[model samples]
Target: TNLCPFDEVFNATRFASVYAWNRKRISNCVADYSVLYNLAPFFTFKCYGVSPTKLNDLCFTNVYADSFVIRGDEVRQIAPGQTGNIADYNYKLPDDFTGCVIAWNSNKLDSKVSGNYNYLYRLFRKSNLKPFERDISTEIYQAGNKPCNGVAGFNCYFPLRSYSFRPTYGVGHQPYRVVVLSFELLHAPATVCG
Candidate 1:
């Protein structure tokens, strides 16, 4: 669960204390009365990939309360089937206060295994409960020879991804944590086993 730094909201008392002095209820509130405190948002991040070399294409999937998005620009790939969710960690921050950003990149080698390789990258940003906006860029090594391994396999792979909070607009302080999910694969997908 997320943590809101503010002990109280809109003059409402916090849940830290159960005593009468610090605890204040609505003037005409009943047992069923509900408070308007904002609810903390949660997110899930996961990635999977397969490669024999250091360079391989990586795919990332971010699942949030509203929707999910995917990115495939990581240099290092996960094993496979790894799932990460914010609720499992300890980061405690309010979800509605600020916006967040995610960025990633990758590196892949050519057919030959002699020289350097190429690069691929992407970026994404979102605010509140809106769709994610994206930006991407890439480049290749010119000096090194075409590195060929004589076999079909991943050469090298690594990914860059992260999120940040908004600067202005909103109130109350909050603390939050992040969880990372990773995995790997041994064999290609085949028909159902006996």
Candidate 2:
């Protein structure tokens, strides 16, 4: 039996409401739907969903090729509000491996319901890996009628919404709640290693 009904799961109106609520925060910006199309990446690792028996076995699969390995425990889901950090976690990549794309997935609704989930994640690197730090930067969109004047009359602005990686919800009208995410990693050759 599906946990969430089609009507409730596929409710466009609900999504629109949330979208509008998010849009409102951006004082002088219009909605930009283009970002939705910007969805491909270098790596395409998939995470196994949390199961009754699996408390914390979420792992990344090398959908492209074997390039690296998890040096420590696999990525895990902490309490409802805590964010997961793979920085402390270890990894081993070939000296030739230059960089990697890290993907993050989480249920955005979990934060909406609990009001305290880590919608954003911070990444850190150890010795061998080059120092890296990236947070989801809000995409800038053109401004609407509202006059937007800044230091030099710039209207380009970012929306004030959660920038975390969110996976499609309500797929096939299944009520499962989980956000899916994926990122890519590249080496010196700029391709997945064999």
Candidate 3:
């Protein structure tokens, strides 16, 4: 049978009836086969510098440290020119989905080093959960920005990171990894020091 134009063929009643029938059919097919899965876990990290002792002094007061993904308990660091994987640090994800959140932060000093810091974060997943077959990818989300001018001029701005996946389900049994990327924020000094 020849197909007619949508407007001409399907009037209000016919269009509604066909649309409802098709929607139900498609829904049933997806429900029976594909299962919704949550590839990543929701969590937060406090920027207490790369060490433990400096946790309260000049840590990232907000989530402006960088970007990262958390798998189980291990935290993978991400940066430019680096592949998004935990093995980059000779680390592997843990079995048994106990859940995880990866986070990090840095400190800024105005008098000594007057420059800005750049940060990046990413999340990846694999179907086989193997270190090799892991088709790594980054989470579209990003953190806010924090800048330290000098002496005691520290500013923090909150910005929402973008995301590719939404309403992740719990399935596929895929093992995922979290990697955080960052770099130095460079800015020219207004006045030269003698």
Candidate 4:
């Protein structure tokens, strides 16, 4: 639980699941009661600025971007904060049983990740200390190192900024919110830059 307080956010304390981290087609409800309540909605996280609320701390303050929970056309923004009942953003469990393949994309999020900062993320599930997936996380680590996968250059390596998350579901709903951690890509120019 020392992972951070928002660690408790995705810690099965709410009503949804993000399936898999990859952009693949998945079936079955991941929420604990989705089947019973007939809830069928997937989610994604977007942060304009993701970092510590205060220096020397792990509580990354999240300035939310836009509507993350994708359900029909009803979109809502969650109150930005360090901690609170995740249930505050939920629709008290959506209804409608006819479910379909669950999928997601980083594109859905409005990207304002500064030119100096490359997008990075870490998704945690309940008690697990590891990320739900690491593609984005990997990009951050590889940012300052080798050149990008396709484009080659020591002083160049910009993340595509877009990602597709495949489906991964359980029987019902499970809470999920990612820690959109930030990291600057070092390319030698600005002091402390590289």
Give candidate 3's TM-score: 0.19
Error of 2 at 147 (Å): 5.3
lDDT of 4 by residue, 1-194 (tens): 11222222222222222221222221121212222123324343232333122223322122111112222221222223222222222211112211112223222232223321222223321222222122222232243555456553564444333222223322121112332223222343322110
Candidate 3, residues 1-194: lDDT per residue as tens digits? Answer: 22212222112121111001121101101010001012212223222223223322322211111123222223332222234343332223333211122322111111113221122112322212342122223322222264433232333222212222222312221112232211112252211111
Roughly what TM-score does model 2 have, to 2 decimal places? Answer: 0.19
Instruction: List RMSD in Å for every model shown.
Output: 22.9, 19.5, 26.4, 20.1
- lDDT tens digits, residues 1-194, model 2? 12212122222232221112121111111211112213432122232332212211222222121111111122332112223343321222232332222322223333233243233222332222222212233444446565554421366554433322223423222112211222133342222111
Candidate lDDT scores, in order, read: 0.21, 0.26, 0.22, 0.25
Instruction: Go through the candidates in order and give the clash count of each.
Output: 33, 4, 14, 16
TM-score per prediction, in order, is 0.14, 0.19, 0.19, 0.18
Worst 10 residues of 1 by lDDT: 14-23
Q: Which residue ranges in model 4 land beyond 4 Å of their true spot?
A: 13-43, 49-70, 76-194
Whole-model lDDT for model 3 versus the true structure? 0.22
Ranking by lDDT: 2, 4, 3, 1
How well does candidate 1 score on lDDT at residue 26?
Answer: 17
What's the TM for model 4? 0.18
